[PDB]
Each structure stands twice: as structure tokens, then as C-alpha cells.
């Protein structure tokens, strides 16, 4: 629902940190205006509604199959702030050179995601080791009966890539939805039989 | 969005707790507290003194900013140290 996102930064920093502290340390001792920016937006906000012509589409289709070497959630929104700017500094018509700063500033919005709930990763792992202990302990034991400390010292120590209370309960929910297994409390279980 | 704090910690100690001890009950037996050579002063008076200080504001020189530049940054260097 929102386009673009971005985060400030922040580190040690002392050649900007320094400079920083210049600009505080003035503003304490001793065309830039109130008004005429004010109406010059509000007349140039609904008197002229500016028109787009191929000479942007051709780099805009451009831009997108680069791209995809969203979906079109980007796509929307990249034309109306490119549209925009052209209807700020040339308050006339279109402009075909506006989309190098509209790809400016949406590779800057995708800096943010270099490094579960849009990634995958960790779920293209996660799912399958859990389908593994499952069977194995479905064929040793003749029943579907397993019980609570069992599962802690069995699971949360063949691998330490995954956390140890944070994801298991939530690892459970899905196999109750799964045709597998049922809760009975902090305690006794029971699971699939063929 | 704030500047500074305090704390009030108890730690036992042999020599301040009677010193305590003597300082609460010595306002039994009398009913009065002064001592330790400080003339009491009237509340009047640095009111005054305040009402008097909050009219002169002064504006520094160009020489405290120059040394809070260099207090920032070491300021900066030790808290940018810790990071627990």
C-alpha cells in the first residue's frame, strides 16, 4: 500500500559527525520565502493537468524488463511521481528525460533490501527438515504417541539453525492443519497412522 | 528526549549509617535540624537572586563552541565503544 520506503542511516561517522556539529554550532550566534513557494504550488496543483506521449514509455518498458532480470504495485506508482516532477519543473507538459530521476530514486528505495513474511529462504529449508522428523520416528515407534520431552530433546539439537521456542510452537499449527498430528496440552500428543 | 538522570541505590555502609542513624534521631530530643556551619539563608533572597539572574542573558563567544566540537567527538568516540 505504500510505494517507497527508506530508511535514514546512521554510524561513528567523523568527517560528517564533525560537519554535523558545524551546523549547530552555528544558528545560535546573532530565494527563501513564506508565502510565494505557497502559491506557487496551489496554482500549479489544477490549472494544468499535463499530458504523458510515447517518448517516456519506450524507456519505461526499458526499465522493467531489466528490472526483472512487486510485480506492478511498482509499476503504478513509478509513473505518478515521474508524472509529477515533470508537472513541478516544467509546469507545462510532459517530459521524457524525467524518468532517470524517478529510477534514481527507486533504486534507492530497493538499497534498503539487501540483508519470512516476503522471503523464503529460510522457508524453502524450514519445511522440508521438518517433513523429515516426522517419518522417521513414525516408523520406530509402533504407536502415534509422542510426548512433550521428547520432541525438546530431539529437535532442538540435531541442527542449531533454527531457534528454540520462538518457531517450534508456531512450526505445530500448520500440521494441525496438515492431517498429521493434535494438541493435548503442554504434554502428551498424537499423530497420523495409516 | 531527555538530558540527564540520577539514582537513589542503597549500599551498605558501616560509617554513613550511623551518621544516618544520629542524623534522624537527633530531631527527636530537640525539634530543631541546623548544624554543620551554613548560615541558613532566607528563600527571599535567592529568589531574588534568580529573578535577577533570569534578566541578563548573557550570548557566548566564538571560543565554547570550538570546545564543544571536540566535546561531541569525544563524546562520540567512547559511547560509539560499549554498544551493550
Given amino acids: ?194 | 528526549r531527555f538530558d540527564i538522570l540520577f539514582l537513589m541505590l542503597d549500599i551498605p555502609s558501616r560509617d554513613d549509617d550511623e551518621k544516618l542513624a544520629e542524623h534522624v534521631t537527633y530531631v527527636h530530643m530537640h525539634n530543631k535540624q541546623p548544624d554543620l556551619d551554613f548560615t541558613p539563608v532566607e528563600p527571599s533572597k535567592m529568589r531574588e537572586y534568580i529573578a535577577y539572574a533570569k534578566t541578563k542573558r548573557p550570548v557566548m563567544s566564538e571560543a565554547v563552541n570550538d570546545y564543544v566540537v571536540q566535546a561531541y567527538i569525544r563524546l562520540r568516540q567512547d559511547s560509539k565503544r560499549e554498544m551493550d
Fill in chain 1, 1 to 194: 500500500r505504500f510505494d517507497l520506503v527508506y530508511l535514514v542511516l546512521d554510524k561513528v561517522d567523523e568527517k560528517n559527525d564533525r560537519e554535523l556539529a558545524k551546523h549547530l554550532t552555528n544558528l545560535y550566534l546573532e530565494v527563501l520565502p513564506v508565502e510565494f513557494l505557497t502559491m506557487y504550488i496551489s496554482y500549479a496543483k489544477e490549472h494544468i493537468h499535463p499530458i504523458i506521449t510515447e517518448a517516456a514509455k519506450t524507456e519505461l518498458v526499458r526499465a522493467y524488463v531489466g528490472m526483472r532480470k512487486a510485480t506492478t504495485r511498482q509499476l503504478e506508482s513509478m509513473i505518478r511521481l515521474a508524472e509529477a516532477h515533470a508537472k513541478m519543473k516544467l509546469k507545462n507538459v510532459v517530459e521524457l528525460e524525467d524518468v532517470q530521476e524517478a529510477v534514481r530514486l527507486i533504486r534507492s528505495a530497493i538499497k534498503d533490501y539487501a540483508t519470512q513474511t516476503g522471503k523464503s529462504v529460510i522457508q524453502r529449508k524450514l519445511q522440508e527438515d521438518l517433513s523429515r522428523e516426522i517419518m522417521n520416528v513414525l516408523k520406530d515407534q509402533a504407536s502415534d504417541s509422542m510426548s512433550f520431552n521428547e520432541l525438546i530433546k530431539q529437535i532442538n539439537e540435531h541442527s542449531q539453525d533454527r531457534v528454540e521456542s520462538s518457531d517450534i510452537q508456531e512450526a505445530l499449527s500448520r500440521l494441525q492443519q496438515e492431517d498429521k498430528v493434535i494438541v493435548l496440552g503442554e504434554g502428551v500428543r498424537r499423530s497420523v497412522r495409516l
